[PDB]
Structure formats: structure tokens, C-alpha cells
Amino acid sequence: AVIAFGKFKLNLGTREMFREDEPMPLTSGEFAVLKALVSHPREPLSRDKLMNLARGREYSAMERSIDVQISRLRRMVEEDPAHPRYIQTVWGLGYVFVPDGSKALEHHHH
Amino acid sequence: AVIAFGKFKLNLGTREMFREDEPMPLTSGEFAVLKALVSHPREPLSRDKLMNLARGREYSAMERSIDVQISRLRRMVEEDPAHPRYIQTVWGLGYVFVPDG
DNA sequence: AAATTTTACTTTTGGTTACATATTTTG
DNA sequence: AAAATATGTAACCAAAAGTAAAATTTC
Numbered sequence: 298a299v300i301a302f303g304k305f306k307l308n309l310g311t312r313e314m315f316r317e318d319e320p321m322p323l324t325s326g327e328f329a330v331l332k333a334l335v336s337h338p339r340e341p342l343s344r345d346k347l348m349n350l351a352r353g354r355e356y357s358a359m360e361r362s363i364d365v366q367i368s369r370l371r372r373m374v375e376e377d378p379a380h381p382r383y384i385q386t387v388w389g390l391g392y393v394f395v396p397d398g399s400k401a402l403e404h405h406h407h
Numbered sequence: 408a409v410i411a412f413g414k415f416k417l418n419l420g421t422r423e424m425f426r427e428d429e430p431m432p433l434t435s436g437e438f439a440v441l442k443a444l445v446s447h448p449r450e451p452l453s454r455d456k457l458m459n460l461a462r463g464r465e466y467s468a469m470e471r472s473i474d475v476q477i478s479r480l481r482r483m484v485e486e487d488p489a490h491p492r493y494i495q496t497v498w499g500l501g502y503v504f505v506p507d508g
Numbered sequence: 509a510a511a512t513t514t515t516a517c518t519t520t521t522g523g524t525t526a527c528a529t530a531t532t533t534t535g
Numbered sequence: 536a537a538a539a540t541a542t543g544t545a546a547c548c549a550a551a552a553g554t555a556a557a558a559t560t561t562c
Contacts, residue, residue: 311492311505322490325498326522361542362523368544369522378543388531389541434511471552472513478554488553496552498521 300335302383302396305374307335321373326351330366331374334384334394339402341393367392410445412493412507415484417445431483436461440476444494444504451503477502 300307307314312328314321323331329351333342344363348356356363367386371378385393385401393401409418416425419442424431433441439461443452446460454473458466466473477496481488497503 310508312495313492320490324521325496358541360523361525361544364542365523365544368542372544386542436512470514471554474552475513475554477552481553499551 302335302394303374303376307331309336326366327370327373330363331370334392338394338396339399341387341390341401343391347391363392410506412445412504413484413486417441419446437476437480440473440480444502448504448506451497451500453501457501473502 298308298310300309304316305314306318309332312323312325314323314328330347333347333350342350344360345356347363348354348360367384368378371381371384375381375383383394383396385395387393387401395401408420409416411417414427415431416428418424422438424433424438424441440457443457443460452460454466457473458464461476462472477494478488481491481494484493485491493504493506495503495505
């Protein structure tokens with residue numbers, strides 16, 4: 298259904314998005330990687346899993362399509378793209394979506 | 408049966424459509440395209456598939472007979488054809504019908 | 509004639525590249 | 536300290552999709 302965060306609400310069902318209840322279009326590629334991030338609150342997503350999730354392809358350290366797509370999303374979702382609040386970078390792993398009053402997930406192991 | 412989206416009822420058997428419960432003519436070609444999308448909720452249809460279910464032909468890589476049917480269909484079903492809600496486009500895959508809800 | 513497919517042009521989209529900045533290593 | 540590695544993002548441009556107008560068909 299609908300997911301809110303900041304001034305935005307995003308309808309995973311229909312790919313509609315609104316800022317302060319005003320429609321704002323998302324391209325298909327933007328919905329895809331935006332959804333994957335949001336579908337998985339607080340879960341750090343590798344570029345692998347993100348490329349798998351959004352486009353059904355395999356990724357590589359060659360490519361920057363994710364990072365560019367992420368950049369375009371931040372400029373249209375983060376108040377400041379420079380210091381992002383919702384679409385955060387986890388260094389050396391990828392990107393994460395953190396809701397308000399939340400911190401990204403840390404994994405425990407054995 | 409009838410599938411309902413927006414101010415529209417498309418009866419898949421009776422094979423006609425109503426806007427606002429008003430009779431709405433469709434050519435066969437447009438109906439064919441419609442039922443293909445409508446019968447597969449949220450399942451993006453490639454153009455390949457799209458010609459099967461609707462036109463009984465396979466598709467070459469660069470003819471665009473489907474795209475123009477979609478243009479014409481939105482023109483008559485979308486509140487705003489410019490930003491469509493029921494007949495959406497999926498970039499590099501095809502088109503999909505996202506039902507109401 | 510009506511219906512529809514293909515042309516021929518326009519706009520959009522998303523990737524790669526190129527180079528700047530940032531972080532962890534000591535290659 | 537450099538050096539190797541990761542990330543940001545602007546800009547360029549091929550492929551993609553919207554569509555009006557012109558062909559072609561319509562068993």
C-alpha cells in the first residue's frame with residue numbers, strides 16, 4: 298500500500314507519488330529502485346541485490362547505474378541531496394532506506 | 408464477466424464497454440488490446456505477448472502498431488493521458504494494467 | 509467509407525563516461 | 536604520506552516510447 302516519509306507519500310501498488318499531497322511522476326526505473334529501498338525498511342541493500350530487485354539483471358563493480366539512479370532520486374526526494382536523510386549510503390555495501398526515528402540495521406553474526 | 412476501473416466497466420464477454428454506465432463503442436482492435444492488459448492485472452505484458460493475445464501475430468523488433476493502440480486507448484480511458492493510471496508503460500518491457508484499489 | 513498498420517518526427521529515458529570528492533589502506 | 540579503493544553527479548547520447556499524419560488494408 299502507501300508509504301510515507303518526510304513530505305512524500307508513495308503508493309507501491311500504483312507507482313503514484315505525492316509531495317505534500319501533490320502528484321509527482323516517477324519514471325519506471327525510479328519507482329523500481331525506490332520501491333526496493335522502501336519495501337525493505339532499514340535493510341542495507343547491496344548494489345547486487347538492488348540491481349537484482351529493480352531490474353532483474355546482474356551487477357558489477359564496472360557499473361554506476363545504481364549510484365546514478367540513487368543520485369537522481371535523492372535530488373527529488375531529499376530536502377538536501379548533499380546530506381541525505383532517507384536514502385542513505387552505507388559505505389562499501391550500498392544504500393538503505395531509513396524511516397524517521399530510525400537507524401539503519403546492523404547485522405549480528407556468529 | 409465485467410472488470411471495473413475508474414468510471415469504466417469493460418464486460419469481457421458481452422464485449423462492450425460503458426463509461427459512466429453510458430454505452431461506449433470500441434473497435435475490435437482496441438478491444439483486443441484492452442482485454443489483454445485487463446485480463447492480466449499487474450502483470451507487465453511485453454509487446455511480443457501483447458500481439459499474441461490481441462492480434463494473433465508475432466511482432467518484429469521495431470514496428471510500433473501496439474504503441475499507437477495504447478496511445479489511442481489512453482486518449483479515451485485516462486483522466487490524464489499524459490500521466491496514465493490504469494494503462495501504464497513499463498520502460499523496456501511493455502505495458503501493464505494496474506487495477507483500481 | 510472505416511479501421512489499422514506503418515512512416516517520420518519528437519520527447520523521454522537510463523546507461524556510460526569522466527572526473528571530483530571521500531574513505532580505507534599501505535597494495 | 537601516498538596509494539588504492541568507493542562514492543557523487545554532471546553531461547553526453549543511443550535506445551526507447553508518444554503520436555500525428557500518411558500509407559495500407561479491410562479475409
